[PDB]
Amino acid sequence: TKLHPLINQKFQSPLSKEIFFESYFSTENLPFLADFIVYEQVVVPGASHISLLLAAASLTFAATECQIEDILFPQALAIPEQGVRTVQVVLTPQNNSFSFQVISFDDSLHISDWAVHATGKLSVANAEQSLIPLEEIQARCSQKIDSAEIYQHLWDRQIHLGQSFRWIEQVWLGEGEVLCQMKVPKTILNTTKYQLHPTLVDSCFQSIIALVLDQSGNKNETFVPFSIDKFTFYNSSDNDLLWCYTCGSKDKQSGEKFKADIQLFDQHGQLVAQVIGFEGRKANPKILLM
Amino acid sequence: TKLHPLINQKFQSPLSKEIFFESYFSTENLPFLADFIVYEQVVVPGASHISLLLAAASLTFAATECQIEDILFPQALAIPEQGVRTVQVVLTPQNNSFSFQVISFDDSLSDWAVHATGKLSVANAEPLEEIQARCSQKIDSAEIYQHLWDRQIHLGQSFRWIEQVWLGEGEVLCQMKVPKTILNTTKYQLHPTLVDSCFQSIIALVLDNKNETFVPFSIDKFTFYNSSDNDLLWCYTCGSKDKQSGEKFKADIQLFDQHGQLVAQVIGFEGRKANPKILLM
Numbered sequence A: 001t002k003l004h005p006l007i008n009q010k011f012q013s014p015l016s017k018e019i020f021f022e023s024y025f026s027t028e029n030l031p032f033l034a035d036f037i038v039y040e041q042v043v044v045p046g047a048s049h050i051s052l053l054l055a056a057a058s059l060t061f062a063a064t065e066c067q068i069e070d071i072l073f074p075q076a077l078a079i080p081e082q083g084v085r086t087v088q089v090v091l092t093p094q095n096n097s098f099s100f101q102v103i104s105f106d107d108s109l110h111i112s113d114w115a116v117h118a119t120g121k122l123s124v125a126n127a128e129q130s131l132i133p134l135e136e137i138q139a140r141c142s143q144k145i146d147s148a149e150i151y152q153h154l155w156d157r158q159i160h161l162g163q164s165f166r167w168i169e170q171v172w173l174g175e176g177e178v179l180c181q182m183k184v185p186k187t188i189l190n191t192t193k194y195q196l197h198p199t200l201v202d203s204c205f206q207s208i209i210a211l212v213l214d215q216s217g218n219k220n221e222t223f224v225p226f227s228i229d230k231f232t233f234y235n236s237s238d239n240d241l242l243w244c245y246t247c248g249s250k251d252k253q254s255g256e257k258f259k260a261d262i263q264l265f266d267q268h269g270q271l272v273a274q275v276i277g278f279e280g281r282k283a284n285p286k287i288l289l290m
Numbered sequence B: 001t002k003l004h005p006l007i008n009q010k011f012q013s014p015l016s017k018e019i020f021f022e023s024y025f026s027t028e029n030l031p032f033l034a035d036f037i038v039y040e041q042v043v044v045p046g047a048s049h050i051s052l053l054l055a056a057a058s059l060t061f062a063a064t065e066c067q068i069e070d071i072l073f074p075q076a077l078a079i080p081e082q083g084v085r086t087v088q089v090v091l092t093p094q095n096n097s098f099s100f101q102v103i104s105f106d107d108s109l110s111d112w113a114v115h116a117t118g119k120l121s122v123a124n125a126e127p128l129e130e131i132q133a134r135c136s137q138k139i140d141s142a143e144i145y146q147h148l149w150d151r152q153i154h155l156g157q158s159f160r161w162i163e164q165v166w167l168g169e170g171e172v173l174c175q176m177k178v179p180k181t182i183l184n185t186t187k188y189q190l191h192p193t194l195v196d197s198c199f200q201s202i203i204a205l206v207l208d209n210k211n212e213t214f215v216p217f218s219i220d221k222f223t224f225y226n227s228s229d230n231d232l233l234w235c236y237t238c239g240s241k242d243k244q245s246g247e248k249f250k251a252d253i254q255l256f257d258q259h260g261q262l263v264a265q266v267i268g269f270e271g272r273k274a275n276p277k278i279l280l281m
Ligand SMILES: CC[C@@H](O)C/C=C(\C)C(=O)O
Pocket: A038, A043, A044, A045, A046, A076, A159, A202, A205, A206, A209, A223, A224, A225, A285, A288
């Protein structure tokens, strides 16, 4: 009795204006969580909360396309060794949308200590596919580079990505743009029940690292996902191969903000997901972790 | 994964002041519900909602004894054949208490019904032969079940807890044993059918229009102290019709062990005559 691999139960009541989704986050319930290690701690990235909201959406809307807007990640979620954190999605009805807060707390002790991990707005969307163009893009992005450079760039910042977070198999650089080929890790097997697997969303955010491999600065810091203007999920892909096109640059005013648009699409070019106004900010992941 | 035979799930959140308990009422999930048949409809009596609140208490308080105050039964709960009603207990914190609403609604589709309201808080803990002397009129338990049978309130086998009855002056002492159909009474605080039987005790004082009987309407305070592992318990009941209007019956009840340990007590029980036809819609 699992509503969604990411959601254990849903609760609503005529005597409550909010709708609740409840989930138990731990390495045993979600094995791939053991593959995102920051300074030796299990950490749930924001991308994961995006996948979680797509799940909730799939349990509340009748349609498949939806959009998450004005996303912020106030506080990172870390899971102590062999620990389990209760995570809730709280949806407040607005005009033809829901304001959402993704929060968590330690169930094993009412409640008083809790944390907010994501906030924003959530509503249905329409199809916009697509399309795309995949061959026009392979022409602008022709400097092949090794995917290891991305993972190594993260490894040096103490962001140790396991197998299930390493979707990017190939990388082509252009002028301020990058095209990644992605394959489903061999350690992931249930992508059919997910709208977008947390690790796939994260890989999409990882693509931006390929535009900042050169930069000088503090080797302790990297660009961490900080805000998103709009994330649109169109439909889930049975495909083991996807393409991810990203473009963006550092803010002219502040060399600590990296702004980008991202497009995840099909082998045939059907747009799977789209990100407008992705902003990452330079940070030491240690300080995010508390 | 069932928290309590009457409660499937519990929910609370730092972003919700209320505590919620959720339960799925249907004949398959709760077999004994098939033993309370009103004019071809399955009906959940108030006593049942009381047992549900005792369950919630056992899942929320640290203490074991608790009390329900200013109880009302705004609307009876009816379950269509092969139907399933979602039933929720909603607890709002007050000053050292909870205001509660017991509600239900049909999951297979804003439309909902309130079946009980009141207040809920902790309580404290507090002679059989002296009683067996004042109550010496042996009478057949069938008289109560027959008296009810005539009002079209048909209690099945699992609702027949009263094995023996001794009547006194405005008082009754009932011997009760667990029907052969019940085997799981250990996980309940107070099994719904036993709570209902206690309310059934008052009928032995009203064996006197045969279409109507006293329907539970309000309770001043219901106190649950502790459950008895005993398959045999004692039921002490006293009360009378309101002196001013012969339509209200007010009574206190004492359920206790063969050893004399008080298991549960009801103060200010008030029932009102009503036609069960009108309850069902
Ligand atoms: C490129 C880093 C991206 O995958 C997300 C990192 C997060 C959320 C963190 O370090 O807390």
